[PDB]
């Protein structure tokens, strides 16, 4: 199942090292994980907490922070940013 990310999401993926414009949903999430790590948006002392305020990611999600234990913010963003091919 291939998907094509809308460009605001693609931008985040490419910044994490992704190539191209088509991906599986799993690939998208793995690049998103890479992004949060390389941009160091997580709290070192509480790594499941992501502080994305003032970052592309925060603006895309419309929030300042979130827990990767609660994927609900991510579901919303995925629905709105992935076009199934």
């Amino acid at each position: 199942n291939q998907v094509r990310p809308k460009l605001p999401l693609l931008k985040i993926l490419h910044a994490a090292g992704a190539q191209g414009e088509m991906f599986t949903v799993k690939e998208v999430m793995h690049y998103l994980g890479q992004y949060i790590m390389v941009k160091q948006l997580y709290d070192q002392q509480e790594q499941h907490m992501v502080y994305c305020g003032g970052d592309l990611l925060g603006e895309l999600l419309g929030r300042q922070s979130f827990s990767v234990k609660d994927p609900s913010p991510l579901y919303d963003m995925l629905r709105k940013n992935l076009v199934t091919l």
Partner: nanobody
Amino acid sequence: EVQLLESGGGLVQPGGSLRLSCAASGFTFEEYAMLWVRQAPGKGLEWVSGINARGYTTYYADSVKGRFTISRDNSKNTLYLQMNSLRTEDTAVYYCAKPWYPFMASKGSEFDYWGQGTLVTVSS
């Protein structure tokens, strides 16, 4: 391009032991927490254990606490699960898992990659 290759499964009697291995490739292993999960007959996938990238922080399900030990050797891109004092209920296909989130060592997700698994049978 992510690939995970479990091995080491087999048949043992209750009280016995096995060591599972997971050969990882297609991503930067040393950047990732890693998990073991398992599926017993007729049941949903159960998270079993996890370990941070640096290998000195570990997590265990209450069901295996004190009996299983997870470890990793990044230089060989390999994860291990040492299983001691095995019980009939540990019978399952065991899977190596890469989390989508690099620091997630304590829980599985729908977005994880798994290998094809290795079968563990404990009976008698």
